[PDB]
């Protein structure tokens, strides 16, 4: 479905279809030689991160082509150190964090120059503590997140002004307990994920009003059992992941109906083909396949490896590098 308010669940998939999801991602880049593969080239490095991460959560990373990915990544670092979504595109903190997350998965970080990544991240910090996405200046708390995430995985959170960074993120906290992209922007789930992730990485979760924010986040559950990203929007598997992660992070995961959300996410699977879509009966893609899998894992699904609600990566990968932010309780 789709209403203004929500979707109706039509007696369809109520089972986890793991083999199908794994065939979907494996052969995703091999479907052809056209499509959005060309038109999504501007986010490719993130798309590779989504397909690697979901494969590994599902225990099936070895089905993917490490070597070529490793060649791809090295070729997207620019001499300033930032990495681009793809070959010839401009560097950006988004794709910088994706590249670092992929090389963490493959324990192959020094495929790229790591002091360079750092100095790229340092250069984006503004006077007030914020981070621009790249030299052209857009300020967003999503990049505060990307900055501190990227450095955490590299062990260099010290390289930026962590105090001022913290101060800018907290100056984006709203009357509903959530956060916007800059001061005065409205709360929404993606933005609350970036911020609570940020505050987790920098040990500031005691600054969050868990009860108020956790209330706001649990109110994203619609009668279908899906979550939306803010009031009056349709449920979506990506907002549901962002909300679920934020709830775990702030100690409020039990405020959601877990069984209904399980059902909803299971209903977003494409029985034929594999993959998950934003909502039931829609077209699947890798981004929603990652969040369908990560959310299930966060809801308790033992087949799936435990995923971090901060990093969206297998918790065993992060343990291994010793990077496990402490969450609320």
């Amino acid at each position: 479905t789709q209403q203004k308010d929500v979707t109706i669940k039509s007696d369809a998939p109520d089972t986890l279809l793991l083999e199908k999801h794994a065939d979907y991602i494996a052969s995703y880049g091999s479907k052809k030689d056209d499509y959005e593969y060309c038109m999504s080239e501007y986010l490719r490095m993130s798309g590779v991160y989504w397909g690697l991460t979901v494969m590994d959560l599902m225990g099936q990373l070895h089905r993917m082509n490490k070597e070529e990915i490793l060649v791809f990544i090295k070729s997207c670092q620019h001499e300033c150190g930032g990495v681009s979504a793809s070959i010839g595109h401009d560097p950006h903190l988004l794709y910088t964090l994706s590249a670092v997350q992929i090389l963490t998965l493959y324990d192959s970080i020094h495929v790229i120059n790591v002091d360079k990544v750092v100095a790229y991240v340092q250069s984006l910090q503004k006077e007030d503590g914020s981070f621009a996405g790249d030299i052209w200046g857009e300020i967003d708390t999503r990049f505060s997140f990307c900055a501190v995430a990227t450095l955490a995985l590299l062990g260099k959170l010290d390289a930026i002004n962590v105090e001022k960074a913290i101060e800018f993120v907290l100056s984006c906290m709203n009357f509903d307990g959530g956060f916007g992209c800059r001061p005065g922007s409205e709360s929404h789930a993606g933005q609350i994920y970036c911020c609570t992730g940020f505050l987790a990485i920098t040990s500031q979760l005691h600054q969050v009003n868990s009860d108020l924010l956790g209330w706001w986040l649990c109110e994203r559950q619609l009668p279908s059992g899906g979550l939306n990203g803010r009031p009056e929007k349709l449920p979506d598997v990506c907002y549901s992941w962002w909300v679920l992660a934020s709830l775990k992070i702030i100690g409020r995961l039990h405020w959601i109906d877990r069984e209904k959300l399980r059902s909803f996410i299971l209903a977003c699977q494409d029985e034929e083909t594999g993959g998950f879509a934003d909502r039931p009966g829609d077209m699947v893609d890798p981004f929603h396949t990652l969040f369908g899998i990560a959310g299930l894992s966060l809801l308790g699904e033992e087949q799936i490896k435990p995923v971090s609600p901060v990093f969206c990566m297998p918790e065993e990968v992060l343990q291994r590098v010793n990077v496990q932010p402490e969450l609320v309780s």
Partner: protein, 567 residues
């Protein structure tokens, strides 16, 4: 990615491959290639503009192409006449609005439009304010255009009462809308409010009355709308002091001063530390958290030397200053007193319920009478039912405590997906009521038996409590925030669902711990009691850790100092 119906593109559309419009993708790739080659050759001309406008016109999120248009346009400013550059800019503006119609939430497109406008000597802001009005009538929940409005308003100066101005003219035949209440939630506090000290409301009572009545007409005209209710919850609730140390306590016997803050804080960090003045003369002390780790904490303490308590004067006087805000807690500890303190009541020191003037009580109480009436029209309206609860609370926790409980049960049957939030919220409010009952009666015993508690809240307000009955509830853990309970001697927590008892650690005066009939599974969950310096009676009867070894001897080696361990 979003909204793509899975229709005719599936292995069952009896129209195999025929996956063309790669004519479009070849065109796309060549065009892309050709831009990239121009750029490295340093050819920053209108040819890059034409080729990127083809590619961004179909995909406005190819961010690298915005960078390329910026490099050309920058280049051209110093080669074009002023009127040639003025036509390029107009053309750029219309090309941007077209690209926003392709994707009204394209980050790179909007930032490209901020880049251009912030570099004009003299922009036409009406063009811009009208584009916002357009993208908002097509989608009132597009928050990108609300941000773009704040951009216009800051660039043009637009002073902050003229902008609220705007929102007014939108409370009527406009609409609802999380985005306009959000905006007023930022505008008002900028424009009026002066948090002086004593009385604790969100808005100058003056504006907080009317901004209530505002969102009233909005939730009355459409109950089944949520922004109004969300914003109304904020309006009821507390400004936060911060200038609040809320308790200080000294124990002669422990030789320790303990303090509790309103929010978890790190003493001695960026903006604050505690200074101690004892007998009106300074005392250098090392502050710590009960666990000695020094993380953010509501509760901090320090050791006192014998000279701060000795019998050299019949009194000591202990003034604590937190320098972040400059708020002050003095307690005075008399000749033979074991303890002394100074505490913030829930009661007078507005710890969580706003004190009401006659005027404010009359409007909230009238909106009491209103939400019921509405409830009879719309009995399954969950927002009305929560706001009735929240309206009792502002109003008089104590007396409408019975009604509160019945309202919670109704709302839980009406909104079962939040049943766990609602039990937790009801627990919080019952613990608040109990603190009023304890303080009202002036004792140090808190009674929270049979309250169907599922979580504990406000524990930093319990620093002086000596006896806590939590028995017969549905608690699953005694959380680490229980470390604020510095005077607790007797904790009766039998008959709950406890499976973790970590926050009993570091409790300095806890002598008796009753944990009968709980869910303590594997012994081992008992390990933390090792750090309880005074524990003398540990009752673990009714837990399944009791069928463990000859258990009454593992526990003796775990807990050699605990005199009586009942399994």
């Amino acid at each position: 990615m979003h909204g793509r119906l899975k229709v005719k593109t599936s292995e069952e559309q009896a129209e195999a491959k025929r996956l063309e419009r790669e004519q479009k993708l070849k065109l796309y790739q060549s065009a892309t290639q050709a831009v990239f080659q121009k750029r490295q050759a340093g050819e920053l001309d209108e040819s890059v503009l034409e080729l990127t406008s083809q590619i961004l016109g179909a995909n406005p999120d190819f961010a690298t192409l915005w960078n390329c248009r910026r490099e050309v346009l920058q280049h051209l400013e110093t080669e074009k006449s002023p009127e040639e550059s003025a036509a390029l800019v107009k053309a750029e503006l219309g090309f941007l609005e077209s690209c926003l119609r392709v994707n009204p939430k394209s980050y790179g497109t909007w930032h490209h439009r901020c880049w251009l406008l912030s570099r004009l000597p003299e922009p036409n802001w009406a063009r811009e304010l009208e584009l916002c009005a357009r993208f908002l009538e097509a989608d009132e929940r597009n928050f990108h255009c609300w941000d773009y409005r704040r951009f216009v308003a800051a660039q043009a100066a637009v002073a902050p009462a003229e902008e609220l101005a705007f929102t007014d003219s939108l409370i009527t035949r406009n609409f609802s809308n999380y985005s306009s209440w959000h905006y007023r939630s930022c505008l008002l506090p900028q424009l009026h409010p002066q948090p002086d000290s004593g009385p604790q409301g969100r808005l100058p009572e003056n504006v907080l009355l009317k901004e209530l009545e505002l969102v009233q007409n909005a939730f009355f005209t459409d109950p089944n709308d949520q922004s109004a209710w969300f914003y109304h919850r904020w309006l009821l609730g507390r400004a936060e002091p911060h200038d609040v140390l809320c308790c200080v306590h000294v124990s002669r016997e422990e030789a320790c001063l303990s303090v509790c803050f309103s929010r978890p804080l790190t003493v001695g960090s960026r903006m604050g530390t505690l200074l101690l003045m004892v007998d009106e003369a300074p005392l250098s002390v090392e502050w710590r958290t009960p666990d000695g780790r020094n993380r953010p904490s509501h509760v901090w303490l320090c050791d006192l030397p014998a000279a701060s308590l000795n019998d050299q004067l019949p009194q000591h006087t202990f003034r604590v200053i937190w320098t972040g805000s400059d708020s002050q807690k003095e307690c005075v500890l008399l000749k033979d007193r074991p303890e002394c303190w100074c505490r913030d009541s829930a009661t007078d020191e507005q710890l969580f319920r706003c004190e009401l003037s006659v005027e404010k009580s009359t409007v909230l109480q009238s909106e009491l009478e209103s939400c019921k009436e509405l409830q009879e029209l719309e009995p399954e309206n969950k927002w009305c039912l929560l706001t009735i609860i929240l309206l009792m609370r502002a109003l008089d926790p104590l007396l409408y405590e019975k009604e509160t409980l019945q309202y919670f049960s109704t709302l839980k049957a009406v909104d079962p997906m939040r049943a766990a939030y609602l039990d937790d919220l009801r627990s919080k409010f019952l613990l608040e009521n109990s603190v009023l009952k304890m303080e009202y009666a002036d004792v140090r015993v808190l009674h929270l038996a049979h309250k169907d508690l599922t979580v504990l809240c406000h524990l930093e307000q319990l620093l002086l409590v000596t006896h806590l009955d939590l028995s017969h509830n549905r608690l699953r853990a005694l959380p680490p925030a229980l470390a604020a309970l510095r005077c607790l001697e007797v904790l009766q927590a039998s008959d709950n669902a406890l499976e973790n008892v970590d926050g009993v650690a570091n409790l300095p005066r806890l002598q008796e711990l009753l944990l009968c009939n709980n869910r303590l599974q594997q012994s081992a969950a008992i390990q933390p009691l090792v750090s309880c310096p005074r524990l003398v009676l540990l009752n673990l009867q009714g837990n399944s850790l009791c069928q463990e070894e000859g258990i009454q001897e593992r526990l003796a080696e775990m807990l050699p100092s605990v005199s009586s361990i009942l399994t």
